């Protein structure tokens, strides 16, 4: 009934009124390349490390089963495809979403939404959490705080789907294209903390985020429980 | 994302953008009490018997997995649940829908939903095809032919569900209930057709009386 038009992200969708985590029961359950699973509300809602991750109602909370025919050294870049296709929702709301790197995204330096991948082996699952008429926590915002009024969940979510089906398309055949991508719309210029700290130069063609130190020492980071924070 | 408040039907939906039938679906997987089955379109969508149910684009069709707490005698009642159920949305988007027994609903002699209850174990697949925007056979119509004007898809899909969450949970209760509401939104007093003869009502079981010119009486199940 939802008449989605998407070629892979989308064909099916699960959702539930009430759900431990879409994450985990992705991850667990058996399930085709594009199912989406979104919840109106997690109970267990986690971000990495399995930090908890709030998830009231009024927010989108959903995630995505990929089976990525890719080298194994371009898959550290689906978080990537789920941080730029928030952001081209966000502008397609007029927000000004700019990516905190590797998977925040953050609208005047306020966290509206993160991305969490997690995988095993043939089966990629792509965590979403996007804060839309939700209360937040602290350090972040929502799309209804950001534009000062309600907007309809469902019609982000029509958006999303929508974007994250072409970026993923285009993944699959150009893998290095997200990184143009992404640093286009991300915090660059201004200095961070990873523990050491540096001017977040740019992000290179492995999508390391470049630190230059006061030094100048180039350091690269890969990600993998390594979060920056913003002076 | 969808913010469905009902109690049991659509506690989770598993939609599909094309599928073969969603009652085959239902039935052959494990899915918990309440779970709505929905397809964009179906290419191997049936009605009873071997007959074939035409799904394109722009209808609504669906199934929903019940487990009824109920006597064993009262399981031929559920098809009035999904009738109804229609009957119900159709009458808040100003539609008058009649119930052709036992699992039709008509709008002005014209076929505009269908009905399949489909028992798998203790799993029970209530099947039911409605005709909002798509192109229909000749004869049947839809929400969109009776209404001038297209149809908001996922706003019946609200409606539906709604009201057949209501007619189910008071089914649990009070599982005679849904025979009052058949018999007030069905065709009766008519002729009808193998033998002849008038329909008379639906009795306790829900089986239709028919009135023979003999004066006979016959119970079809
Ligand atoms: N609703 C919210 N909005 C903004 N920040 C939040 C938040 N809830 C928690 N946080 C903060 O964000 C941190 C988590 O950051 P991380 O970088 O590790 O992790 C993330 O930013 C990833 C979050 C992924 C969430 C989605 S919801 C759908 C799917 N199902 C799941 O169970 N997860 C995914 C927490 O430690 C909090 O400080
Ligand atoms: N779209 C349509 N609108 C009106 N009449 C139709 C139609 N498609 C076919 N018909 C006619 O209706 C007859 C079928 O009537 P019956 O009384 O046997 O059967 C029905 O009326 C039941 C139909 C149940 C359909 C739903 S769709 C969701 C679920 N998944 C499935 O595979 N099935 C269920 C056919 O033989 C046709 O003549």
């Known amino acids: 009934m939802l008449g989605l038009k998407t070629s892979i992200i989308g064909r099916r969708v699960i959702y539930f009124q009430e759900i431990t985590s879409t994450n985990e029961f992705a991850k667990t359950s058996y399930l085709e390349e594009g199912t989406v699973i979104v919840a109106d509300k997690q109970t267990m809602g986690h971000g990495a490390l399995n930090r908890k991750w709030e998830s009231p109602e009024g927010g989108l909370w959903l995630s995505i089963v990929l089976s990525p025919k890719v080298p194994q050294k371009d898959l550290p870049k689906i978080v990537f495809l789920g941080a730029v296709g928030v952001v081209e929702t966000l502008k397609e709301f007029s927000i000004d979403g700019r990516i905190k790197w590797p998977?925040?995204?953050?609208?005047?330096?306020?966290?509206?939404?993160?991305?969490?991948?997690?995988?095993?082996?043939?089966?990629?699952?792509?965590?979403?959490?996007?804060?839309?008429?939700?209360?937040?926590?602290?350090?972040?915002?929502?799309?209804?705080?950001?534009?000062?009024?309600?907007?309809?969940?469902?019609?982000?979510?029509?958006?999303?789907?929508?974007?994250?089906?072409?970026?993923?398309?285009?993944?699959?055949?150009?893998?290095?294209?997200?990184?143009?991508?992404?640093?286009?719309?991300?915090?660059?210029?201004?200095?961070?903390?990873?523990?050491?700290?540096?001017?977040?130069?740019?992000?290179?063609?492995?999508?390391?985020?470049?630190?230059?130190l006061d030094s100048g020492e180039v350091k690269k980071v890969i990600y993998g429980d390594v979060s920056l924070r913003f002076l």
């Open 103 to 212: 998977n925040d995204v953050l609208v005047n330096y306020k966290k509206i939404a993160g991305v969490l991948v997690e995988g095993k082996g043939d089966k990629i699952v792509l965590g979403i959490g996007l804060n839309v008429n939700n209360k937040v926590p602290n350090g972040a915002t929502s799309m209804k705080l950001e534009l000062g009024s309600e907007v309809p969940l469902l019609s982000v979510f029509r958006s999303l789907i929508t974007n994250l089906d072409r970026l993923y398309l285009n993944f699959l055949k150009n893998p290095m294209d997200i990184l143009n991508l992404v640093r286009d719309n991300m915090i660059l210029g201004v200095r961070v903390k990873i523990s050491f700290e540096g001017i977040a130069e740019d992000i290179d063609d492995f999508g390391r985020l470049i630190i230059r």
